[PDB]
Amino acid sequence: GSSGSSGDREREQHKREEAIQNFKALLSDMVRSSDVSWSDTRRTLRKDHRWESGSLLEREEKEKLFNEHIEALTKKKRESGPSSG
């Protein structure tokens, strides 16, 4: 079908989707490090502006995202404990 996307085919979900991606990006930008704890993070994000819209994601959802973002970062880190299977 037409490559270009247009129309109000998907608005409901879309609304949320935006929050999801936006949340992740905000985590990397704000929390670029991986040596931090959820508590501190959440509190910090709670002050951010975008966070407002992030409300969509339930406490659990948000917490999960952050954690995942951290573990992922370390992986990139050149020097890091022996992680294999």
Tally of contiguous helical segments: 4
Distance between the termini: 43 Å
Q: Give the percentage of residues in beta strands.
A: under 5%
Given this structure, which CATH class is correct?
Mainly Alpha
**How many strands?**
0
CATH architecture label name: Orthogonal Bundle
SSE string: HHHH
- Provide the structure class: mainly alpha
State the shape. Answer: globular
What is the third-level CATH name, the topology? Arc Repressor Mutant, subunit A
**What Rg, in angstroms, do the CA atoms define?**
16 Å
CATH superfamily: FF domain
Number of domains: 1
Q: What oligomeric state is this?
A: monomer
Q: What's the helical proportion of residues?
A: 55-70%
Let me know the largest β-sheet: none
Domain FF: 16-72
Subcellular location: Nucleus
Organism: Homo sapiens (Human)
Protein name: Transcription elongation regulator 1
